[PDB]
Every structure is written in structure tokens, then in C-alpha cells.
Amino acid sequence: GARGGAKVVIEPHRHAGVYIARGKEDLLVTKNMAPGESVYGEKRISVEEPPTKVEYRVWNPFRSKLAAGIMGGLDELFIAPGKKVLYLGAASGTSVSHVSDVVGPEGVVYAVEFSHRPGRELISMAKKRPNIIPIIEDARHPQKYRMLIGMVDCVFADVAQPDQARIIALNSHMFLKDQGGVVISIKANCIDSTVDAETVFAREVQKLREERIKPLEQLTLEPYERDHCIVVGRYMRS
Amino acid sequence: NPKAFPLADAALTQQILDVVQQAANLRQLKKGANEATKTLNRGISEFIIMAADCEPIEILLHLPLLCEDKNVPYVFVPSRVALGRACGVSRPVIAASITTNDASAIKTQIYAVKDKIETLL
Amino acid sequence: EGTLTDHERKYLNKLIKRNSQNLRSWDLEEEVRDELEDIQQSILKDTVSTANTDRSKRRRFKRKQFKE
Amino acid sequence: SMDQVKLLKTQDSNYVRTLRQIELKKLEKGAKQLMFKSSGNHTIFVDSREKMNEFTPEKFFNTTSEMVNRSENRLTKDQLAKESLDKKKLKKFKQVKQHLQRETQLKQVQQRMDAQRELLKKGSKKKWKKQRKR
Amino acid sequence: MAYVLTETSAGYALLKASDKKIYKSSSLIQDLDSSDKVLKEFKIAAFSKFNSAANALEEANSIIEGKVSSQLEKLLEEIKKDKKSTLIVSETKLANAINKLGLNFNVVSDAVTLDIYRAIKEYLPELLPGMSDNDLSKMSLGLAHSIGRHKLKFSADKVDVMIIQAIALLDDLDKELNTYAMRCKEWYGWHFPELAKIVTDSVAYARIILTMGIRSKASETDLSEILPEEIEERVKTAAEVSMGTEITQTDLDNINALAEQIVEFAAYREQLSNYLSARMKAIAPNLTQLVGELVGARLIAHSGSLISLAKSPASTIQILGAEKALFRALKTKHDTPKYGLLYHASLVGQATGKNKGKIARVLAAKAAVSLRYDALAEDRDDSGDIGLESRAKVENRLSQLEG
Amino acid sequence: FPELAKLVPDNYTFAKLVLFIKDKASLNDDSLHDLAALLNEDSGIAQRVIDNARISMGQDISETDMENVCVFAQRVASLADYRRQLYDYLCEKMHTVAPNL
Amino acid sequence: YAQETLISCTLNTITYLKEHGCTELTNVRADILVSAIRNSASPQVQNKLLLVIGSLATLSSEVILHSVMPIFTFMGAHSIRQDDEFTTKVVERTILTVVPALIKNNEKEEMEFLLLSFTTALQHVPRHRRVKLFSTLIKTLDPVKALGSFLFLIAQQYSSALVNFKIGEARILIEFIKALLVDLHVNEELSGLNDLLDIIKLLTSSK
């Protein structure tokens, strides 16, 4: 598809900080915080703009669930430039870098991960991106790393755990702003594989509702991913 | 052996040690750690079996990292001498892999075992 | 401030038209989509595979159900 | 297929796989290069039935009818305020297809090579008789 | 009096609440919505700023483990004068921990104080005059990385990247030293061209120019320490019958200085070799015990990381360095290479004939064994024991295979 | 100390500054004056390095490791001095050999 | 801390009285309050004292702000000087309450006095706070009538800057004043220019 010889046209996406590369093939794209290097081997689009040479990173949706949400057409993304953003289940910088891209230098990204091995690649990537604050800790006890986190306008959790909802529940109570953002990616197989997906996705919605989270939208991620979806809701403390 | 995880349990190991036996008979078994690594790289493995009693255990601890990278299920059995005997050899086998073949005559129970390992994981 | 008169609500409506027509050229024609989607789905099924996953749900579903 | 037979009768296990692994990687880069159109199912939650009945796609996103159909890039309406080319797209979508077709073809040839060489292997071969090897 | 223990990446903050049971009011959200209200409700009592990034880490780790630190204990001690006062603390564990200290304080940790902590943590950049949000963000950002290294057991003496640049540097340093060497050969060769054919070693060639400036010095100058007896007298004879022309002291001064560069380049090259040796015996001692240090550094470099080579199966480890013979051989129906980079290991050297092939397979297999213990072992002892026993097994194989 | 590489873009000054500031932990007001003597405080880097050295992500390297940095940095300094010497010799030599050209 | 709780209590009671809508307080006096800012060097005590007079601008208006002008002098030199947003809030709140109250009370002399107090510290004001604070003062005062006084006072500094060769400081004054004259409307801008020229004519007549 996209090749060094090919020329592409970059235009803005409906979401601030998300960009589209037209041409032969229509790419989901973000500005690079650290130009000249690819975090997970993603291809890079470099453009002349008045002339400064701005550099971009391709966002592969098959690799990042959030990007799969973009192409599926999420109505609202609380993740945007100039916002504090808290990320749970941070295996590596495959998606954090792109989230670090959209927030921009002004924003910050709080990355949380539990396993020692995936974390070491995350901290290596955090060195290139000053706006990422890496947290090697279990999300089941947000009290441990309350030390290191301010507020967060939006919490988006990719923890593939049966107890994912509570992990969101506790973190949102600790840090999330009132009327703040909540974006949950769900994989029904982990929490309950026995029952069909549709009943599973309904079940979690009530749990978020029980935790004063008002769900706004949800999106299943085929053809990229099976038995998955992203749920979007707002934190109504009152 | 804390790191060997998940470790198949006494009931489960039979269904594991059972399936490997026919796979050896039908030549669908790749045995020994180095062969297992081949199968993951080529992606011709249903799943991989490791022995927890190995000394020093780490030798197989590279295989899991390759496993979740490729989304291939894996499980540990308690005894290596048991595994090699099930493989059909005179030497203990620490790691073994089942070769992918949808046309095999033992096809059903392999995936039945695969599901159980997936639940175990 | 929501002080739009009739005139402003038409000029912007023209802009809504103007930009929307432009993006159609990038969005490409329908007939190629009819064939491109056929090529698209066939790539996806193999690379994702997932035939085993769909069946495995049935095997799990069948196994759990009581047999009378 | 005549191609597999000529490949099967004149090439070696060493050769076949090396091609098979090349295409597997080059397919992966190709598939990664390709992007698809959403088939994802998607639901809206609404507070009240009266709010539900008056719900319409135009209002929710603040967009137009041409754009509701476009889930990928449904810009807000406030934000708004090639036959050879489209053929080149299809070649890329098609150019990866020959890899996918080729890869199973090479996979088939490798499997036949492995089956024959296994037969040449020294064994009981009653179908192999259960016999522990020393 | 009600006190709140608030922990900040800059330091510990105590906040004395005007209401002793502020944690028992149900309108806390409304009362603490704005910066002005929270400043009125809470006024700073004591603040201990972390003097150094290190001190922050133990202080942070103490918070993680629920233990009261000395700085917190002293800072809490400053308020002990206030009899019958209430401590509001985020954590029950720290609440219970402060409780064993037995200070004259009723410690409270409940869900209601969550709202205070949310609100106090809301306007923290304002609540702490003198520190900006960016500075807090930077201090927050830094403390994470320091904590992150500690939890992941990161150690300065256990990073494989150093080898990769060192080996790349070592290959680099060999190149220029040669380029400067040939230049000193040509530049000094003009004065005395016959040196090069006699003495081939670059460092020895440079040292001669240091001891001797001009061929007239050749008659009396002694080159014993640089050269053996027979070679030193050859260069002496070549001096008088030299075909080259005399050069000025200005030319001598600079060409000498070049000779100084050669030897000091050489001196550091040995230092880097010793430095590389030390690194490998720390990151991969078992591998070094088996294959060696020069080869092992190349081993990790070809893969790019210890984990990658650790995940690389041993058969690959055999033939990582002869791919072009390989992929040429595989595509062309010819025998494949069987040593790769491992041909330069010591062990393969003692082997002979076809046995050299067999050792490579055995040694490559054992190389994976030593490495994976070098790579994936969480509490590895820097002894190389797994390599040493592996080395013994290979040697026994060769003794029988050779005999 | 990754931030420092950005502070002093001129490589030669960076090497000299590294030779002095061997460990970013060591930060004194007197040391601030000494590094302030290196180059000039007009750019303000002298205050930046103290502030940046206080808060930075640079992972500490072992004593042997930093020994390589300073000596290898010392190696770069010598070549720059030599290159200046050779340049003067070349300037003199052309005047003697080809004064006209 | 005795005074610290004392001032908070008064703010507590003033809020309660405001709820009951006490029209005016007869014997309340600000001289005690003003002395506190002078005597109490604690900024927080001073800031709370500023909160108090702000609430007290509503209650007993024109009867307890006869000597409110000193508070402006101290804030122009002290409160605005500190780069604390809370001190930015109190000076912001004081300007939007006390200054209108002074108008409700020879009304030009105090207005320009308010302008002199803050303008003398213009170069002292933080840049990010400079535009906003003076932007607040121009709006609360009648901009048509006050802008001319602004533009002349700024005219004096930059002129001294050129005489002082402070070109960098001189240029800064242009962007601030221009960015200040941004926020205004068209009618406001022209009136001040007319007022500035009138001041210039007054000077020319004097010579």
C-alpha cells in the first residue's frame, strides 16, 4: 500500500489530533511527538508544511483497539490535545505512543501495567516521549500509585481481566474528573466465554451504571477483532 | 517451580499426555524445545507442552514469551520423564509441540484439549 | 452568538455543500467499492482465520448443554 | 494443480519453505499496508423514550446525510463550515491476493514433501506400529 | 483539630482542617469545588520537600509499603503539640501504621475523606505556592521512572545495550586506526619508505617514529623494546641506504604527533576490549564461559538484544553469521553453511575435520542453554555455573569424538 | 543525562561539560559557577543543567561505564586540538610551497 | 492564627448577613480592616482581608469604603506583584466589586488614581497576568472615559524607554497596549485616541 515513492495528502480527522492520509489508500494517522523513529515498526509519513518538515506515524487498527474504534466511527472521544489521560493495561507503547500523540506536548499520559517483562519496553519508549508517565503497578490497587497521578479527564482501560470493571471503578473514583471520560474495551471471552457476546456486553453496562458511570456509546470492532467492543461513558458523580 | 504457570492438574495431564501419544503415532508431534521454537516461528503449532520439573527451568521459559506473541495456548505438565515417555522416546522430553493438520484423524480431541488449555489460561 | 440571519445560514449551507462534494472525490466511486469489498472480505477471512473459534464456541455450547 | 506438481516433482523441502516464509512476511506487510471498511455493530444509549423517538443520526453527531453513511470520517458539520487511480487501489487489494492464494499453494506443496519424507523415515509402518524408539 | 496527610511528589504536606469532623459532612463536594474554598478550609501545617531524587524513591517506596518514613515521622512530630487532634489519611494501612506510632492523634481513614483527597488533589498546584504544574508534572514524571526501575529490578550493570554500542564502537575503532596507520606509513614512508616492508605492525611502526625522528638517529637509537634483534638491525641498515629525502623539524613535529595518536588509539582499544570483557561477564557470564567474550558480543549484536537471541533457537544460533551462504545455498540446491559466526569460538578451534561440524551443533545447542539462563533468570548469580557445567559436557563430547 | 545533550548542541563544549559533570547527581552552587565559566551563562544553560540534572530520566551508568565516556570524550578533545595544529601546519606549508596559489 | 480565624469568622458572618439582606451597616469601619493589611505581613492574612472588603463592598456600600483607596495602592504594589493565581483571584474580585462601588459614590480623580497605582507597576506585573489585570480594570471603569488616561500613562513609559534606550522593553509596551486595545470595541478605541490627543493639546498649551 503506502510506500516511500507514493505521495499522500494529509487532512484532519473529525477528532482533534487525529489525521487522515489520502492518496491510494486512506490511512488513520497521528502526529509524532518524537520524529524520526517508529515505536513498533509502523510506517511514517513525512510532509512539508510552511517550510517545516512535519512527520507522522501510521496507526494500525489491527494492533490498537482504540484505532479500531476510530475507523468504526466513535461519536465522542474524550482523548484530545491538551488533556490528562490515564491508561490501564499498558502492555507496551504500541497504543500509548499514539495516545501520547493526540494529547500532544501539553497533555500527559499515565500508563499502568503489571507484568515486569512488558513494562521494560514501555519505560524505554517513555524515554522518547516526555509526556508519558509510566506506572509499573497493579491496577487492582490504585491506592498504591495515587502518589503519581493528578486528575484525569478520560480513563480508557484495555485490561483483559475478569475484574476489569471494578479496576475502572476504583481508578475512576480515585482520579477521574466529574463528568469525565470513560472508554472501555471489552473482550467477552476473558470475563465470560460461555455465554454469547451480546449478553456479555449488556452485563458490563449495568456494572458501569452501578458505579455512577453513564454509558453514552459502544462499538464492536469487527472486522479487526472478534467478540470485542469499546464502550464510551461519562462519569456522573452527582 | 512457582514460575511454571499455568500447570496442568492431575486430571488434565492425562488428556494432555493422552493426545500427545497418538500425535507421536501419527507423526504430528514435534518434540524437544528447539523443534517447538521452529513450530512457533512457522506458526504450525496448535499448542505447546512444557515440563515443570525441568532443571534449570528457564530453558523453556523463552517458549511462553513466543507463545502469547503468536496467541498460541500453552500449558505445563509436572514431569518431564512422563512427557518423553508419552512422546515415545527413551529420553526425557522437556517441551513438545503438536503440528497443525486439519485433515488429521485425531483432529477433534486436540482442539478439545486446546479449549481446556485456553480456559486454563 | 446565534445571530445568524437567513443569508448567513445559506452561505454556510453552501460551504457544507462545497466541502462535502470535495470529499466525495477522495471517497472514490461506488462501483469499485462493489468489487473492492469482495476482495476485502476474502483477504480478511484467511488472515483472521477464526473458523476454529466460531466452531469452538459451538463445541463449548454443545458440551455444556445437558443431553437427554 | 500443474504448478504444484512441477514444483513437487522438481524442487526440495529446503527451497519450498524459504519461499513460503518470504511470502508470509511480505503478505503481513501487505496486509498491514491495507486498510478495510468497518462492519462493526454499534449501539446508542438514550435516556428517555421521547428522546429515543426523536433521535436521528443527523442530530447526534452534528453531521449531514452524506456523512452519516461514512462512519470512518464523519466530521462535524461545524467543521465543514480517477478511474486509473481507483484501479491502482484495486491492484493493491488484489496484489496481496496472489500472496494469499500462493501461500496456501506453497503450504500444500510443503505438506506433501513432509508426508513423503516421513514415509521414507525408518519406522515400523504397519499407519505406524506403536514402537518406542531407542 | 483535624489534620490531613497529603502526599506530594515534591514532598509531604499536612493540612489542618478547621472542622474536626470535616470527614463527617455530606456536602463536601459542594464545599470543596473551588480553589478559594479549599484554601480557606485547609492551611498548610508542615511541608517536607524531598531533597534528592534518591530520597524521594525510598520515601515513595515507604508510602507504597504502608510504612511511616523518618521524614514523615519527624514532620508529624512537629504537630504533636496539638492535643486531641484528628489525622485524616488516605490509606487504612498508613492509617494503621501511623497508629502504632502512638502519637497523640485520632487517625481517620474512611470513604468520606476520598472527597477531600479528590478536592485537595484537584487544586494541588495552587495549594502549593512556589511550584508550577509543569514542575509538578516533571517531578511526578521523574519519580515514576526511578520507581519503575526499582520495581523492575533494573541495575546499571545489567543493560545489554552497552555491549551493542561497545562492539559497534570496537569495530569502528579498528577502522580509523588502520586509516591513520596507512597514512603514517605513506607520510613517513616519504622520508624512509623501507620501514613498511620490514615492520608490518602499525603500533610498532608508530613507536619507531617516536623513538627515532630521522634516519641519522637510526645508527645510535635502540629499538630493542619495540623490535627483536634481527628486525631492528634490518631497519638500521635500511636507514643509511634509504631512498627517501630529509624532512624539516616542522614536518617531524607533526608527523610525530600523528604517531602519538596511533599508540594512544591503540591503548584505548585495549581498554575497550577489557571493558567489553567486564560487561559480558556481568550480563551473560554463562555464555562467556562457553563461547567466549569476542564471539558472545557478536552473538548479541547480530540479534540486537539478549532476549531476541535468547528467543532465537540454537540451530539459528549456529548459522546466524553465514546467511548469505545459507539463503544462496537454500535457493540454489547446495549444501548449507554449518558454522556461521561460531567458527571463531575457541572450542570449534580444537576440533578438526568433520568433528568441527559436530561441535558447532553441540556447542550451539549448549550456547542456547547458557544464554537463556543469562537472559531470563530473575535471580541469576554472576558466576557462570550453568555455562561451566555446559562447557564440561561439550569437552567430554570432543574427547570421545576426537578419540 | 539525556536532557544535557539538548542543552549544549555544540559537541565540543558538550564533551568538555561532560568531563566536568561526570555524574548529574553532583550539583553544587560552586560547581554551578565552574560550569558557568565553561562557555557563558548568556544562553542560561548553567542554570538549566542544574535544574535539569535535579529532575531527569537519565539512567545511572556504572563507574566503569562513565570512565569510558570521559576517556572517550577526552579522545575527541585531543583530535580537535590536533586538527587545529595540522591546519596551522598546512597553512604554513602552502605559503612556502605555493605562495601565489 | 488568632487573627486568621478572626477574619474567617467575619467572612462567615458577612455571608450570613448577606443572605438576610441587611441593607447597610452603620457603625462598621474599614480603618481597622485597612490597618490589618499594613500591620499583618502574612500574604494569606492580607488576601483574606481583601476577600472581606470585597464582600463588604455590597454591605454598607459607600459608608465603609471612604478610605478604600489605600487597599488599591498596596495591591498594585504587593498583591499583583506575587505570581499567585489566588492573589490574581482576589485582585480580580476586588476590582469587580470595590471599583464599581467607588463609582456609585469629582469622580475622575479617584479613577485616575486607581490607574496610577497599577500602571506604575506595569513593568512589574507578570506578562501572562499583565494583559488580563489591566484588561479587567479598563472594563470595570468606563472604558470610553478611562482609556485615554491609560494610553497617555503608557505613552510616558515607552517614551522614557526610548530615552532610556530600552528598545526591548519599549517594543513590549506596544504589544501589551495593542493587545489591550484589542479587547476593546471600535467606539472605545476611537474615544481614547481622541482623549489622548486632548491630553497632548493640554500639554502643548501648558508649554
Swiss-Prot record, chain B:
UniProt KW keywords: mRNA processing, mRNA splicing, Nucleus, Ribonucleoprotein, Ribosome biogenesis, RNA-binding, rRNA processing, Spliceosome
| Domain of life from the UniProt record | Eukaryota
Instruction: Explain what the record says happens when changing residue 77 to L.
Output: Impairs binding to U4 snRNA, but not U3 snoRNA, and causes pre rRNA processing defects and an accumulation of unspliced U3 snoRNA
- From the record, give the transmembrane residue ranges: none
Annotated GO biological processes are: box C/D sno(s)RNA 3'-end processing; maturation of SSU-rRNA; maturation of SSU-rRNA from tricistronic rRNA transcript (SSU-rRNA, 5.8S rRNA, LSU-rRNA); mRNA splicing, via spliceosome; snoRNA guided rRNA 2'-O-methylation; spliceosomal complex assembly
Q: Which cysteines are joined by disulfide bonds?
A: none
Which Gene3D superfamilies does UniProt cross-reference here?
A: 3.30.1330.30
Q: Which residues form the signal peptide?
A: none
The entry's cellular-component GO terms read: box C/D methylation guide snoRNP complex; nucleolus; nucleoplasm; nucleus; precatalytic spliceosome; small-subunit processome; spliceosomal complex; U4 snRNP
**Which GO molecular-function terms appear in the entry?**
RNA binding; U3 snoRNA binding; U4 snRNA binding
| Effect seen on changing residue 80 to A | Impairs binding to U4 snRNA, but not U3 snoRNA, and causes pre rRNA processing defects and an accumulation of unspliced U3 snoRNA
Q: Which Pfam families match?
A: Ribosomal_L7Ae
Cellular compartment(s): Nucleus, Nucleolus
Family label: Belongs to the eukaryotic ribosomal protein eL8 family.
Name this polypeptide is given:
13 kDa ribonucleoprotein-associated protein
What organism does the UniProt record list as the source? Answer: Saccharomyces cerevisiae (strain ATCC 204508 / S288c)
Curated annotation (Swiss-Prot), chain C:
Primary subcellular site in the record, as a coarse category: nucleus
Q: What keywords are assigned to this protein? A: Nucleus, Phosphoprotein, Transcription, Transcription regulation
Q: For this UniProt entry, what's an example GO CC term? A: nucleolus
The record's subcellular locations are: Nucleus, Nucleolus
Q: Which family does it belong to?
A: Belongs to the RRT14 family.
User: What is the documented function of this protein?
Assistant: Involved in ribosome biogenesis, probably through modulation of rDNA transcription.
What is the additional note?
Answer: Present with 3670 molecules/cell in log phase SD medium.
**Name of the protein this chain belongs to:** Regulator of rDNA transcription protein 14
UniProt organism field: Saccharomyces cerevisiae (strain ATCC 204508 / S288c) (Baker's yeast)
Q: Which residues of the full protein are shown?
A: 104 to 171 of 206
From Swiss-Prot, chain D:
| UniProt superkingdom | Eukaryota
Q: Where is this region: Disordered?
A: 114-134
* Sequence similarity: Belongs to the UTP11 family.
Give the protein name, as stated in the record.
Answer: U3 small nucleolar RNA-associated protein 11
- Complexes and interactors: Component of the ribosomal small subunit (SSU) processome composed of at least 40 protein subunits and snoRNA U3. Interacts with snoRNA U3. Interacts with EBP2, FAF1, MPP10, RPS16A and RRP14.
* A Gene Ontology term for the protein's cellular component: nucleoplasm
Main subcellular location of this protein, as a coarse class: nucleus
Q: What's a GO biological-process term for it?
A: translation
Which of UniProt's keywords are assigned here?
Nucleus, Ribonucleoprotein, Ribosome biogenesis, rRNA processing
Q: Where in the cell is it found?
A: Nucleus, Nucleolus
Question: Which residues of the full-length protein are shown here?
Answer: 92 to 250 of 250
Role summary: Involved in nucleolar processing of pre-18S ribosomal RNA.
UniProtKB/Swiss-Prot annotation, chain E:
- Molecular function GO labels: mRNA binding; snoRNA binding; snRNA binding
As for subcellular location, the record says: Nucleus, Nucleolus
Q: Which UniProt keywords apply?
A: Coiled coil, Isopeptide bond, Nucleus, Ribonucleoprotein, Ribosome biogenesis, rRNA processing, Ubl conjugation
One Gene Ontology biological process: maturation of SSU-rRNA
Q: Name one GO cellular component term.
A: nucleolus
Every copy of the Nop domain together lies at: 283-403
- Where can the Glycyl lysine isopeptide (Lys-Gly) (interchain with G-Cter in ubiquitin) cross-link be found? 281
Name the domain of life this protein comes from: Eukaryota
Q: How does it assemble?
A: Interacts with SIK1/NOP56 and NOP1. Interacts with the trimethylguanosine synthase TGS1. Component of the ribosomal small subunit (SSU) processome composed of at least 40 protein subunits and snoRNA U3.
The UniProt entry's sequence similarity note says: Belongs to the NOP5/NOP56 family.
Q: What does this protein do?
A: Required for pre-18S rRNA processing. May bind microtubules.
* Protein known as: Nucleolar protein 58
Q: Which species does the entry assign this protein to?
A: Saccharomyces cerevisiae (strain ATCC 204508 / S288c) (Baker's yeast)
Task: Write the span of the intact protein that is present.
Answer: 1 to 403 of 511
